């Protein structure tokens with residue numbers, strides 16, 4: 001008779017960017033050729049040694065049937081070996097690792113495990129909009145931590161109203177940062193961990209861009225003293241290895257957090273395809289020069305693109321410290337980012353991400369991703385040049 | 394410095410299967426060799442054309458990057474074509490199909506999409522124990538529909554208390570049935586759909602064993618006229634195609650249910666690796682010879698096993714109408730099925746599944762999965778024979 005979705009469905013936050021993606025289709029069907037610098041989809045293929053590890057693994061009939069609920073020990077061991085090689089961090093593979101079907105699933109599981117209806121989650125502004133999903137589906141309340149350029153886009157924890165710290169049960173942090181490009185160090189992480197320890201806040205660090213800091217090796221949150229006491233770090237295969245489509249991620253950290261994850265997941269999953277696990281293990285154990293090479297590709301695109309914007313458009317952009325995103329100020333003749341991104345879409349047929357989809361503190365920037373080939377980057381600039389916008393002002 | 398799991402975690406129900414598996418692992422740790430007829434874990438390999446489809450697909454760099462949130466259209470189309478071919482049911486691939494990372498995840502998502510705290514979920518007794526997880530996690534309330542042997546293990550909807558039909562938002566049904574092997578027909582599905590329609594209950598049919606009905610051609614719930622009006626059917630690749638480890642499943646049915654699922658999964662569980670999707674497409678469009686051969690193998694195993702048990706133990710068991718499970722009664726000397734299954738594990742080094750985890754109507758039964766070749770099943774019986782039990 002009448003189909004009735006649950007309240008969790010009715011209250012789901014609107015995916016605001018998806019409306020742009022739809023306008024794109026309606027334009028590309030009218031004849032528009034769109035250059036899309038709005039999304040974080042790696043353009044380059046998964047390295048062939050990873051692909052071949054999947055292809056070989058899939059022939060093993062041991063992976064055809066049900067596997068361990070919590071994943072294969074060989075992958076958890078690869079994860080521990082990886083964290084030691086890359087970050088100098090000691091991880092117990094048997095107690096401190098959990099697997100996820102991508103970071104997005106990990107964020108949902110982690111919030112369901114750590115947030116009660118009515119609890120407060122501390123979330124950065126600007127910040128990855130998907131943080132909102134898990135929090136809303138947990139029926140919890142959001143409290144913003146503003147990231148200002150003056151503070152290097154790191155939150156000031158003493159600015160947080162002490163009135164919320166009792167209800168505050170979870171905090172998100174993300175460095176190297178989407179969308180700002182900013183980076184954090186061991187000292188910041190130590191401070192964060194000290195703060196969470198004092199006010200009993202579970203700390204989830206989103207390390208999706210942990211391979212991509214240009215001036216130095218990125219620090220893991222888990223390098224900080226007391227990080228393992230208060231939190232966990234979410235690591236994705238998506239960006240590091242051009243494995244976005246493969247849907248793999250893991251959490252490393254506090255064994256009590258990991259236990260709660262494992263309990264939840266025992267009710268919903270039976271691990272994941274061992275062919276995928278073996279590919280993940282070949283990714284982690286593989287030559288890190290592949291990832292360094294990938295980092296140099298992004299850095300070249302960043303250098304090429306920002307130099308070209310400045311010369312051709314008079315659009316000066318700060319070079320990011322990490323990630324493949326450029327966080328660019330909009331012309332002061334536009335009031336908001338949605339208005340500027342809409343103007344560029346309509347008049348130049350290009351896509352940038354309006355900064356306000358990351359929160360109110362993004363309203364005067366756009367996010368521009370460097371996951372496109374050189375000539376697409378060039379054609380973006382060529383098209384915008386015709387608009388004659390006052391980027392110089 | 395105090396980690397505090399959420400109330401969802403604190404109040405999780407017993408993970409009955411996990412607890413059985415754990416006992417089996419502990420026994421194995423002693424160095425004992427075990428014949429494991431517990432979990433319904435297919436012993437035969439994935440058909441090689443499916444494996445080769447994965448291997449070829451993984452070379453395609455389109456699948457290396459993000460794809461469509463709700464799955465590739467080629468797979469949704471293969472699913473519609475499969476449903477037309479096998480069941481004669483018309484499915485709109487653009488609106489009436491959702492993809493899941495396995496039937497177990499599908500159950501979770503469907504309960505989350507359809508139940509509010511305080512709603513009532515109608516569940517069979519006996520029933521798949523994992524129906525309880527999603528219900529409990531949604532903070533919904535459980536109300537049992539007894540499945541009795543004399544009713545053919547079909548529920549009598551007219552015996553449900555009318556008082557609960559107001560708060561009842563969801564009903565699970567499962568034919569061919571885990572654990573009893575019971576089967577259902579078009580008339581029953583029509584009857585259930587009319588009942589759901591009348592009292593506004595969303596109906597989820599679990600069709601995990603839809604390839605394994607031995608006598609009649611298996612009927613989909615969606616063959617019934619009012620079915621797509623009230624509900625949806627959950628189909629797994631695990632049993633049909635020996636794809637248990639691959640974690641792939643789908644729901645087909647009412648477009649509004651499928652919409653709620655999509656909106657949920659958009660935020661959480663986006664489309665799996667496109668390689669897996671192509672493999673799944675090859676599964677569905679593959680010649681149904683392999684499936685029929687698989688069905689024949691399970692049948693021969695059931696025939697063999699039940700006869701041997703009768704001859705050597707005096708353990709009489711009904712042959713199932715479907716699935717690869719046998720549902721068998723425990724001796725009068727045993728208090729509970731847990732005690733009996735523990736006893737066989739400790740003293741015969743064999744695994745069966747204690748019937749109690751399926752509900753109180755399984756209290757005096759065990760489920761045995763025909764998931765090893767005949768000469769393994771013979772050794773299962775030989776081992777139990779040495780215990781001299783009063784199976785009569």
Ligand SMILES: Cc1ncc(COP(=O)(O)O)c(CN)c1O
Pocket residue numbers: 433495496497498521567571599601629630631637641642
């Ligand atoms: C009735 C029923 N439903 C759902 C499932 C879940 O199967 P999967 O997740 O492997 O698809 C199973 C297999 N245990 C089952 O027997």
